[PDB]
Structures are given as C-alpha cells and as structure tokens.
C-alpha cells in the first residue's frame, strides 16, 4: 504494497536487463521510459500533442518487473522528464486506487 | 471505493458550489481545475515549466468534495486540458495505490 501519496510514488523497475526508477502515474495512459535499449520490433508513435508531438518507439508485449511484479505490456521509449508507469502497466500489476 | 485503472480514473467533485469531473492523478503534485469561481484570497503561482510556465491562481484551504469525501486543500485555478486531482488532495481523502 500500500502506497500513500504524501510523496511522489516512485518505484524500482527492471527493464531490458537494467534497474531503473519510475513514477506510478494514474494520469498517464501509457508507460514512457528513457535510456533503455530494448531488443526486438518497434514502431514509431506520436504522443503528447501540446506544442507539437513527441515521437517515441513503441515496443509491444515487453517483459518488465515493477516493484517485484513480473508483467508484460507496451513500453514507449523516448526522452521523458521522468520515467512513467502509466495505467497500461498498472492494470497488469493489479494496482488500484483505494479510499 | 476501489478504482481499477483500465479506464481513466475520473470522479465527480463538488467545488465552489459547482458539480465537476476530474482525473485522480498520482503523477500530479497539485490539483488544477478550470472554470471555477472561488471566493476569498488567492495568489498567482507559476506551474509547468516545459515551453514556459503557466500562471494560475492559488487558493489555499479550499473546501472540496471528492467522490463523496468532504476535504480541504489547495486548489490551483486556471485553464487545464483536463481537471486534475493531484496528490495534495488524494492524501486528504486517504487515497492509496494498492497491489
């Protein structure tokens, strides 16, 4: 696990053989990570939309471990002010909002 | 409630005598709402920081009802692509991330 929100909900993740930190972000539809080199196929995706769009590489069905939970989901790779775990992967880990 | 994240976590809020909808956003530090007229004192605040800054009006200790929970917290008022409930108010309602 239960994570309170007095601080930013940053967790440890393992992706592409690396250890990283990322923010559990219920306001984000998608997961965006920078400085990861993933193997296998990708296609460009345009995201954002305020001020222009940002182009990232979309990798599908990426194995990723989030705070000890080994899951699979789409990961967008490109420059991001902070690494973000979006709803797409929070559903996979069974993460809910509770009050 | 327990809210799953397959869809955007949009909830009903009551603020300044009005009924609105807003996104429960764990990636946002602050709560930003548009098209509300709040009574009492405010001060300008600069937020964002990508491409420039956005100036909003900061109202402190604002009574707000979020999904049935009457709480108090800072509300920033200004144009926002989507009304956002940030961690500052999610802590007030006792909202946690669970998995």
């Amino acid at each position: 696990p239960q994570i309170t929100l007095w601080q930013r909900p940053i967790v440890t993740i393992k992706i592409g053989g690396q250890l990283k930190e990322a923010l559990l972000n219920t306001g984000a539809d998608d997961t965006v990570l920078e400085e990861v080199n993933l193997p296998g196929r990708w296609k460009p995706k345009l995201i954002g939309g305020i001020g222009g769009f940002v182009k990232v590489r979309q990798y599908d069905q990426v194995p990723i471990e989030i705070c000890g939970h080994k899951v699979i989901g789409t990961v967008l790779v490109g420059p991001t002010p902070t690494n973000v775990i979006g709803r797409n992967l929070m559903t996979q880990i069974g993460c809910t909002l509770n009050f | 409630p327990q809210i799953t994240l397959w869809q955007r976590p949009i909830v009903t809020i009551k603020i300044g005598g009005q009924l609105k909808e807003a996104l429960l956003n764990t990636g946002a530090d602050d709560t930003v709402l548009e098209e509300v007229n709040l009574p009492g004192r405010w001060k300008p605040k600069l937020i964002g920081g990508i491409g420039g800054f956005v100036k909003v009006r900061q109202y402190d200790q604002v009574p707000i009802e979020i999904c049935g929970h009457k709480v108090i917290g800072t509300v920033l008022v200004g144009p926002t692509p989507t009304n956002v409930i940030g961690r500052n108010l999610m802590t007030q309602i006792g909202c946690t991330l669970n998995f």
């Binding site: 972000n25 539809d29 998608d30 995706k45 939309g49 | 990636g27």
Partner: peptide
C-alpha cells in the same frame, strides 16, 4: 512536477 499524459 504535476504530470498526467496522453498521445
């Protein structure tokens, strides 16, 4: 740094 996001 409030965040959110789409695309």
């Amino acid at each position: 740094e409030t965040f959110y996001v789409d695309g």
